[PDB]
Design a protein around this nucleic acid. Structure first.
Lengths: 150, 352, 351, 354, 153
DNA sequence: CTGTTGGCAAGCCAGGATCTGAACAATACCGTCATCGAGCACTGCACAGA
DNA sequence: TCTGTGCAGTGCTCGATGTTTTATTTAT
RNA sequence: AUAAACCGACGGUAUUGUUCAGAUCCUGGCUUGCCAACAGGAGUUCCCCGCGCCAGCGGGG
């Protein structure tokens, strides 16, 4: 019923260099629909069910920043994305505002740019849960977590 | 007809003409779709600060909250007409604040001021204390002929058009102005998903990479501009001006609404586009055409042609359904038809 | 039928037409989702203070009330509590062949009769009475020259009405207007540039605003209207009702309109007669979803709702609809009007 | 007239003249269709870094955020004219940052500097030192004559053209420049679906397959370039220059807008194409002809010919639509004075459009 | 305003051996506008309307790969073209790319060869809709169904 | 008047690194309790006598 | 036949004043 | 004719100025589309008309 976030994280990690490069050169989440390697990656995670499609597009597009940009770290809730971006000490607060205010597709593009810069260490299944809904509530909590960390 | 409705469809090339606290394009939800927006206050300030306004209407008002700085301006400007003492008391009575020599004296809020209007007031103040007339009774006297005060707004027309409020001083009683022009926020006739410019700043002392990487929102858009002018209110706000005087001012607004574009980001985006359609209509009740674009316009050889077409179709629907027959004229580059804007303006000048 | 139901769907461009004590747009929860709201009192005042109202209601022919013509029926109405001596003395000092009489007129005069009856008993008259009742007399004299306004909208917030019969309700009832769809409001972040300040602005602020397809509902009590017009005819009442239809379609509250200018006329107007007045708000209880705008799906949802419940709700009766849109129409039981004026005439002619 | 509008239609062969962080071509939606884009900042740097600029205008500005590196450059260039202590103090007063011997001193942001301008400030700081004039009082008195400062922007004309921002130092009072040149992002007059080049890198020591595989987005396009020059602002930014010098500078911008092309990817795509059409007109009001291509130009024996058609057609509609009678001249390879050569157009501009 | 796909499928299957043979002979869809038997077939399907005819050219050209090539079936969504080509197991992924990347008329030629090669069992009306809107969305869903079905096996 | 069929559709291997992501200034005011008596206004009041 | 100073008569705006308020502050 | 009735939360307001994404790169090697074939059969053509041997020949549509 729910996407196995760690399984997908592992699948992306041990992906062959070819399939990985084909996914990484995508410039926005919807372009993943043109990549055969993308479909094979997310098929065992419920892609053919339309319920999961928008979530899987966000998850994989965030991962597509690189195999080594998002480092999963186990809980001791676990490190949220907002706290993780602040933990890097590289991201200006203004860029977080611009992220949480952005509309569709543009938000994912800006997020991935932030992930590239920040190289966050976080709780990946927790971030995936956030990417699944990605409502106005999740976006405000992102900004507030970032601010509460700094 | 007391109202002059003005309708403009103007298309802009990629630009960022109006942005918010996070430097992102202003927008609005209309018909369930995001439209790029230019605030009415941005439009009004672009017009009042323009060369055309200066040449054809006069001096824009002085809007400030810093009375100590204002004090010094009036002393330099009204010095050869009044003594410094009278100038200080006049500002003090109007603002309700103690005007001394303090470095910082602040009003209640930002307030538009007209020098010519202040000049008129200090005459009264001088004559008041000369006739040994105190301030409480001076106010009582001045409240009896507000029209004589409003004649000074011919030196500050943007106040007659856009209004003024005050919560302290004699301006509370004497300077209450209900603007004659109503104006909407410019919105795009269509849905816009804004573009993002990823830029760098190359450093001449840094050989590896750039010193700054950033993003900037921008987009194109066909915008609908709407405004109307209450002629009777405009005459009253100018101290009892004639209809010809009001009509000529309205004509300059028509021109500015079709040609004036906010300066923001124009040095690096240069969207200096004039309107492709202007429509003026006299009416008894104000009529906006915005619902021509409630269903967002789909592109079809551009957004401009289907926007103008959507405007025309909705205009007919309203006119036929509500039986409207006020005078109307239309200028276009793509109801009396006007080949040029100038002919359109003569039309308005001549009461339609 | 006794009730005229008026249904309006009107689309507004980005605006703030009605706000509260935090300057936030007024709203309401309907069907568990937030709708932007324009209050009853705001909408009604926009009508009552409009120019159209002042010309067609404020300057009506039935406007004036003549105490002279009302002497007979007043003489028998108050004749059991008062005798003709006081009743006629009162009737003349207030002013200086009528069949019926407006209820508040009887009640307010009856109060004046109580005063002069107590004035004769306390053995004072001349100016002393006209000094004590100076403001009261001035009050009723003004009200006697605003009979249609009082019959339609009810008494003013300051009227000088004295009795319980003087608590005059409006014959028209205006509901709170709410959007047919859910709304998340926008925010305008604004500056005020100081002409004497170098760095930055002198003020910063925010203003909440939004668009919205609103549903306006109003009903008119005909018998109440006639009865409060001294016993006017159905035709005369239907003539007043025609003006209400016009105002509910065209009048918009002035708030924020100088800077947002949402001067939009209604895209759909429908009138129907019934014995039991009903709002069709539940057409939008399930919030309308946008499909090429909110307006078309709203009219569509209004039409589909009528087709479903009108019969069972006893909305048989004369029904007509005007529309700027070419959306698939309601049941053929509703007569389509191509212009607003044709709709209004249909109302004058009793349907 | 105060404004000189410059319009350029320029056709490029397949290339990637301006790209983003994903190596994708910069684009923009206009008329509801994708236009390939070359940013205004790319054009501006291409021009100010060009050989033509260096030969006809002078040295472009020094733009940096690194004050410690700048400190060393100034200590060497002005070392024979001023003591090291006043060179440092001058830079510190201008930047609002402390200048010591530290290896890393950052400004608020990338800042345009003119060495001659800093040299001028050194003379003022030195004089204030000799008169025991307060730093706060030096700022006050220098603030009373901005024009004297702006004379030094003749050694940095690209600043007078494109402006300068300041958030710290005396520059917030003394160094604010409103740019005289407005310039748009170049966009294609037509819709474009960009091509993708799938490339390999053959490894001479690897027999099976290539060592790297990749992709590069590219496309051709007819671009519209727009820019105008506020002649009054240009004269003021240069400390009170004449119209002649302002027109001389404006003419150089005309030339560059028609010939200068961003160097990006040109080593492997070589889209070295000059303009096919240059239009210049004087006006009281800035005027862009972009809406000539609001409706995307469709191909008809090329995009270039229908683009010039759409340009001329819309130009005529606006000219009499708004009653625009300002001087206008036109040059192309394929009332408005026609010019056979770019050089004749340029002399026309120099002569105030006469 | 939609073409009766199943009726056209039946009209082709019942068509006389001579007329349908004249149609198959064609090498590219635009050449069908010179064959008399073609108009004879697509006449009761609104060839008059210019909007229908471009789709009708594609639909018939695919039907003209053979008569027995496209075995229509009924839904138990219904089998898409992408699923069907992958179900045959004769088509490799690079040939699918050569379809969705092919230019005008070249695409239909490639599709024709693919049908002949694969001889697919599919839902014909579903396919007919794809050929009507032969756009970027259809190419993309075509590749999707092919890759997923192939990967499943 | 009449137009066909079989048999068949490939595999290997390969997708990078460097380095960089801003600062300043500014966010308002009024009215929607009440009390008491005084000093000072509209405002009609007849008139007396002009 | 209209109008003028005294009112009586009061409609007020004027100002000082009765009372009384404070509670919080992540997660790492 | 319901803590009901009568019943606006109102008025003023640019978010601004500065900025290359850039340097390096074969998609490449192998491959018949091939075997069989008279374009022949079949006088419907619905009229007006003129001359016949009654078989059939003509001019107008």
């Amino acid at each position: 019923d729910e996407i196995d976030a760690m399984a997908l994280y592992r699948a992306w990690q041990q992906l062959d260099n070819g399939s990985c490069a084909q996914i990484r050169r995508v410039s926005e989440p919807d372009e993943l629909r043109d990549i055969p390697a993308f479909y094979r990656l997310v098929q065992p995670f419920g892609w053919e069910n339309p319920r999961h499609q928008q979530a899987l597009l966000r998850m994989v597009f965030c991962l597509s920043a690189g195999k080594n940009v998002i480092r999963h770290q186990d809980k001791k809730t676990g490190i949220s994305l907002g706290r993780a971006l602040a933990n890097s000490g590289r991201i200006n607060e203004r860029r977080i505002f611009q992220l949480i205010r952005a509309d569709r597709t543009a938000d994912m593009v800006q997020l991935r740019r932030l992930l590239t810069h920040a190289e966050p260490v976080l709780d990946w299944p927790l971030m995936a849960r956030m990417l699944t809904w990605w409502g106005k509530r999740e976006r405000q909590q992102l900004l507030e977590d970032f601010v509460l960390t700094t | 007809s007391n109202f002059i409705n003005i309708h403009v469809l103007i298309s802009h090339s990629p630009s960022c003409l109006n942005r918010d606290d996070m430097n992102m394009q202003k927008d609005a939800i209309f018909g369930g779709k995001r439209r790029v927006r230019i605030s009415s206050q941005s439009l009004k300030r672009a017009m009042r600060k323009s060369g055309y306004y200066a040449q054809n209407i006069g001096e824009s008002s002085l809007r400030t909250i810093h009375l100590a700085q204002l004090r010094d301006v009036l002393r330099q400007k009204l010095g050869e007409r009044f003594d410094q003492k009278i100038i200080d008391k006049t500002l003090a009575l109007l603002s309700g604040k103690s005007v001394d020599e303090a470095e910082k004296i602040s009003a209640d809020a930002v307030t538009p001021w007209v020098v010519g209007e202040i000049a008129w007031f200090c005459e009264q103040v001088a004559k008041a204390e000369a006739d040994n007339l105190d301030d409480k009774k001076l106010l009582k006297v001045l409240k009896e002929d507000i029209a004589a005060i409003r004649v000074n707004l011919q030196q500050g027309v943007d106040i007659a058009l856009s209004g003024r409020m005050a919560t302290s001083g004699m301006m509370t009683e004497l300077g209450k102005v209900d603007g004659a022009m109503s104006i909407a926020h410019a919105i795009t006739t269509h849905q816009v998903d804004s573009d993002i410019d990823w830029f760098t700043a190359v450093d001449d002392l840094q050989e590896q990479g750039s010193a700054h990487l950033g993003t900037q929102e921008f987009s194109s858009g066909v915008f609908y501009r709407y405004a109307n002018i209450n002629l009777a209110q405009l005459q009253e706000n100018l101290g009892g001006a004639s209809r010809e005087q009001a009509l000529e001012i309205a004509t300059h607004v028509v021109h500015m609404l079709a040609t004036e574009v906010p300066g923001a980001k124009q040095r690096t985006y240069a969207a200096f586009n004039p309107a492709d359609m202007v429509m003026v209509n006299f009416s008894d009740m104000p009529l906006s055409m915005a619902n021509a674009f409630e269903k967002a316009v789909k592109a079809k050889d551009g957004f401009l042609q289907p926007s103008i077409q959507a405007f025309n179709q909705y205009w007919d629907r309203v006119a036929n359904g509500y039986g409207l027959n006020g005078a109307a004229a239309q200028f276009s580059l793509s109801v009396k038809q006007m080949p040029t804007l100038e002919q359109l303006k003569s039309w308005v000048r001549n009461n339609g």
